[PDB]
Each structure stands twice: as C-alpha cells, then as structure tokens.
C-alpha cells in the first residue's frame, strides 16, 4: 500500500531528503524549470503530454512552463513537510496521484522523473546516496499509480 | 487585468500579507481544513463542486478533504513567496486560475473565500486590516478567471 511505502521511509532517508531539499528547494523557479526541461530533453516522448504549456522549448521565457515548474516544486515542498506523519504524507500523495491518473500517467512513466532529479541533485554535488533517497520518495507516489 | 490587479499589492499590503501568513501558514493542516470547511458551512451552495472529496461534513476525518486542504495552503504559500516578483506571481496565479476555470468557477464564486479567510484570520486575532489585504491577493486570482 501507499501507507506501507510511506511508513518505510527511515530516519536516515528522511535526513538525506531534507538536507538536499534545503538546497534544491531554495530556488524553486531555477531548479523547477531545470527539472522539467531536463525531463523533456532526456525523454522527448513525454513532450506531447504537456501541450497545455505551449512551446516548452522556450524554457524560462514560457510563462505557462514557469508557473507549472514553480508549482511542481511546491508539491515536493508539501511532501517533504509531511515526512514525519505518514498519514498526512499519504493523503497529499494520493491527491497528486489523481492529478496524474487523470492524465493517464502510469507508475512506470512517473518514474521517468528519477533521471532529471538525479541530474539536478548532481549539479549541486548531491551524489548517488541522495538520488536513491529521492527515488524512494518517488516510489511512494508510484504505489498510488 | 491580472497585471493591474497585481499592481495593487503595495508595500503595506505585502507586509500585512507576510505578517499574517507567518501565523496562519504555521499550521497548514489545521488552518487549511478550517478554511475549507468554513466555506462549506457558510456557502452550502458550493459543496456540489467538491463531489470528488466525498462527504465533506466529516472534516478532518475525511482523507481526501485533508489532502485537498493542506495542498490549498501550499498554493497560498506559493503566492506569498512570489510577492517580490510580479511576473512570477502572475504566472503562478494563472496556473491555479486554470484549475478553477476547468471546474467552471467564476470570479464571483471564487470570491466567496473572502468570508472564510476573514473568519480564520479573526480567530487568530487578525482584524479587518488583514482581511482586506488578503482580499486584494484573492482579487488577483479573480482577475484571471
Ligand atoms: C517529482 C514528480 C512529479 C511531481 C511532484 C509532479 C507534480 C505535478 C503538479 C503539481 C501538476 C499540476 C496538476 C494540476 O494542476 O492539474 C502536474 C501536472 C502534470 N504532470 Fe506532473 N509531476 C511529477 C512528475 C510527472 C511526470 C514524470 C510526468 C510525465 C511522464 C508528469 C505529467 C504531468 C502532466 C501531463 C501534467 C499536466 C500538465 C498540464 O496540462 O497542466 N508529471 N504535475
Ligand atoms: C484562496 C482561494 C483558493 C485557493 C488558493 C484554491 C486552490 C485550489 C487548489 C490548489 C486546488 C487543486 C487543483 C487541482 O489539483 O486540480 C483547488 C481545487 C478546487 N477548487 Fe479551489 N482554491 C481556492 C478557492 C476556491 C473556491 C472559493 C472555490 C469554489 C467556490 C474553489 C473550487 C475548487 C474546486 C471545485 C476544486 C476541485 C476539487 C477536486 O475535485 O479535487 N476553490 N483549489
């Protein structure tokens, strides 16, 4: 269950998530756009899903893409803030899961975000240990898809 | 015009928004559920739009309602964090406006949130001065609907 995935996050994993978020979450506009644009760069097959955003090749200049990217970072802020109460983490994760289920995004496709997260983390010198911790958080959402 | 509306957020208004948010934003789960449930209590005619959340009279005990309410508070957090840059405030406001336009929510009905905000603020000893500041922020979203 999603609760199981959530309840499994250990103290060490939560520590790594919080420490790295202190940095990557400090510039939501910059890192959010980097995250989304990297997804498009490395997984071009996903571009079609974001037609509402218009020309995503415009990057930062695209106001719809910028608004979407900043907001995505607040979903992550939400997750990080709920780490110590699995009950609250689960209800917010299911909320965002619905946003993706309606767009026909499978658990496997949602996992495509792990590559971009790993790259953004690396840009701030957060290595594999941190990428693995984030993959565990993403897996909580995957349990809901 | 959303831009002209954003221009109404003067130094004094921004300060009142930040000062009051420091308190109401400190308990997103508690104050978010209070805000949403007050909207339902005071404007029963809006409950029909929230069919996805199930039985909203259950308040905090309703997982979907709790997830929705917490997330709503992060949208407000987002707005507050963008107060320094109007172009960014506008792009995030338009993102959330679309979420409501697709739900068929007009500027007038969106404005029904002012009553609940005034009440939640009053419960934390923040009077009309603050309620009016928040009404100006809500007005930016209304301009985009
Ligand atoms: C860290 C992981 C991710 C987070 C936290 C996240 C968060 C969000 C948020 C907050 C929204 C806006 C929901 C709405 O207002 O309707 C959104 C929309 C969307 N997401 Fe994600 N997402 C993630 C990964 C992905 C991935 C990997 C895909 C695709 C393979 C995806 C596809 C979509 C699509 C198609 C939309 C709709 C965009 C639009 O038309 O506005 N998401 N996402
Ligand atoms: C401070 C004001 C408000 C904020 C910041 C806000 C924010 C949000 C957010 C973040 C969502 C989730 C969007 C999504 O994932 O699709 C949402 C959904 C929704 N909002 Fe609001 N909202 C506000 C006021 C209102 C008001 C006053 C109404 C109705 C009169 C309204 C009606 C809706 C509806 C119908 C949904 C869809 C719920 C669902 O089925 O999940 N909102 N709102």
Curated annotation (Swiss-Prot), chains A, B:
Main localization of the protein described in the UniProt heading: cytoplasm
Lineage top rank: taxon: Eukaryota
InterPro entries, sorted: Globin, Globin-like_OT, Globin-like_sf, Globin/Proto, Mb-like_M
Compartment(s): Cytoplasm
Globin domain: residues covered: 8-145
Cited Pfam families: Globin (PF00042)
GO terms for MF: heme binding; identical protein binding; metal ion binding; oxygen binding; oxygen carrier activity
Keywords, ordered alphabetically: Cytoplasm, Heme, Iron, Metal-binding, Oxygen transport, Transport
Binding site for heme b: 100
SUPFAM superfamilies referenced in this protein's UniProt entry, alphabetically: Globin-like
Entry keyword Chaperone: no
Keyword Endoplasmic reticulum among UniProt keywords: no
Record-level GO cellular component terms: cytoplasm
Record-linked PANTHER family: BLR2807 PROTEIN, GEO09476P1
Assembly description: Homodimer.
Similarity comment text for this entry: Belongs to the globin family.
Record protein name field: Globin-1
Annotated source species: Anadara inaequivalvis
């Amino acid at each position: 269950s999603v609760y199981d995935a959530a309840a499994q996050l250990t103290a060490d994993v939560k520590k790594d998530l919080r420490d790295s978020w202190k940095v990557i979450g400090s510039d939501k506009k910059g890192n959010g756009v980097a995250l989304v644009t990297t997804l498009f760069a490395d997984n071009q097959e996903t571009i079609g899903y974001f037609k509402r955003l218009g020309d995503v090749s415009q990057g930062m200049a695209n106001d719809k893409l910028r608004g979407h990217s900043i907001t995505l970072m607040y979903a992550l802020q939400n997750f990080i803030d709920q780490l110590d109460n699995p009950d609250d983490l689960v209800c917010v994760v299911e909320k965002f899961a619905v946003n993706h289920i309606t767009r026909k995004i499978s658990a496997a496709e949602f996992g495509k975000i792990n590559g971009p997260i790993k790259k953004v983390l690396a840009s701030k010198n957060f290595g594999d240990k941190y990428a693995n911790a984030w993959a565990k958080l993403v897996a909580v959402v995957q349990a809901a898809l």
